Amino acid sequence: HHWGFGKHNGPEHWHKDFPIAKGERQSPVDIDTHTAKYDPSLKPLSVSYDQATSLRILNNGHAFNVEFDDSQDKAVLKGGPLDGTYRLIQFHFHWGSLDGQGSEHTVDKKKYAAELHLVHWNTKYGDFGKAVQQPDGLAVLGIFLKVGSAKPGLQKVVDVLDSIKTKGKSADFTNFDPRGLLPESLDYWTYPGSLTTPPLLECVTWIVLKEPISVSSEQVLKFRKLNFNGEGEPEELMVDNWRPAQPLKNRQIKASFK
Ligand SMILES: [Zn+2]
Numbered sequence: 001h002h003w004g005f006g007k008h009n010g011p012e013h014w015h016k017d018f019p020i021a022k023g024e025r026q027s028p029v030d031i032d033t034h035t036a037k038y039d040p041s042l043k044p045l046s047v048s049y050d051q052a053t054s055l056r057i058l059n060n061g062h063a064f065n066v067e068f069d070d071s072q073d074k075a076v077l078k079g080g081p082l083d084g085t086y087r088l089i090q091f092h093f094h095w096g097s098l099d100g101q102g103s104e105h106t107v108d109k110k111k112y113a114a115e116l117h118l119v120h121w122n123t124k125y126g127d128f129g130k131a132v133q134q135p136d137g138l139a140v141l142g143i144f145l146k147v148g149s150a151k152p153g154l155q156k157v158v159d160v161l162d163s164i165k166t167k168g169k170s171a172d173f174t175n176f177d178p179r180g181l182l183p184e185s186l187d188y189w190t191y192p193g194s195l196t197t198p199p200l201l202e203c204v205t206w207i208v209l210k211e212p213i214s215v216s217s218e219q220v221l222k223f224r225k226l227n228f229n230g231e232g233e234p235e236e237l238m239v240d241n242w243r244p245a246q247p248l249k250n251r252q253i254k255a256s257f258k
Contacts, residue, residue: 003198004062004228006236011243018198025202026246027193028104031253036189038258045186045207045256046079047141049179052088057160058170061228062197062241065090066157066173070121070128075178077120077139080207080256081190086120086139089128091178093117094196095223097239099147104196104242105208107144112212113220114145115242116181117196137203138195143183143213150216153180158222167230183211187257196243210257 003009003017015021052075057066067090068075075088095114096102103112118141121131131137156176163171187210194202226238 005241014198014200018200020194020200020202023194023200023202024249025192025194025251026200027196027204027206028106028243028245029191029193029248029251029253030106030109030245031189031208033108033255036253036255039254039256042081042190042254042256043079045077045141045188047077047179047182047186049075049088049177051075052176052178054173054176054178056170057157057164057173059164059167059226059238061167061230063092063094063238064161064164064226065092066176066178073123077118077141077207080188081205081254082139083136085123087123088118088120088178091116091118091181093145093223094242095145095220095239096242097224097237099217099220101240102242103144104245105142105144105206106245112144113147114215114223116143116145116213117141118143118178118181132195132201132203134203135192136205139205139207140195142206142208143181144209145215145220146212147217147220148214150219151181151213153177154215154219158219161222161226165225165231166227166233169231181213183209183213185209185211187211187255189253189255191251191253 053069103115125131193206
């Protein structure tokens with residue numbers, strides 16, 4: 001028995017094993033576009049993914065991660081509200097059972113079909129494990145997905161999902177370019193938050209892009225064929241692996257645009 005997204009172990013339960021779930025800077029949150037403040041001081045984001053080296057793609061029981069080599073500054077994020085260099089370690093998605101839900105963050109209460117998270121850690125702290133223990137340890141780039149036209153750059157990921165259907169399964173996944181998942185504009189909101197699954201550590205600077213990226217219904221449908229369970233166990237479909245919006249509390253959401 002452990003945390004998950006079921007009826008008896010879902011987000012509403014998590015606080016029993018992870019008290020920080022009721023913390024002061026939990027994520028996700030609803031972004032109220034009229035209360036967000038434009039900050040002229042925010043510099044443009046600097047995304048350098050030209051040397052990214054993907055290694056593998058694995059089904060960890062609550063989502064699937066596409067892991068990168070983070071032993072050097074190959075794929076990094078700089079600028080924006082960040083101070084220093086953040087290395088990309090993995091990206092994953094959260095999606096729903098229906099096109100009307102799936103994203104973790106919402107915009108004026110609007111939910112998207114899914115949300116892509118590109119996780120980076122602050123190199124000053126030496127490794128990922130140390131970085132999550134710091135208030136400025138992680139930077140997570142969030143991108144919304146809406147259902148419409150297919151996204152060519154995502155098909156490579158969609159095609160290998162069959163090989164990692166169940167929990168614990170992994171597959172080699174080299175030469176994948178994450179630049180094919182980025183929207184045209186890099187305008188963003190940003191706020192201090194946490195990691196949206198256990199252990200919900202409040203070490204994250206969140207950078208949520210304003211412009212969604214479109215994926216086809218067929219592509220999202222393949223996400224919904226994955227399993228939370230391990231092979232040989234009763235099938236439960238991996239859907240609705242998103243945490244509901246949390247109280248903003250004493251936080252301000254800033255926008256890089258007006
Ligand atoms: Zn996530």
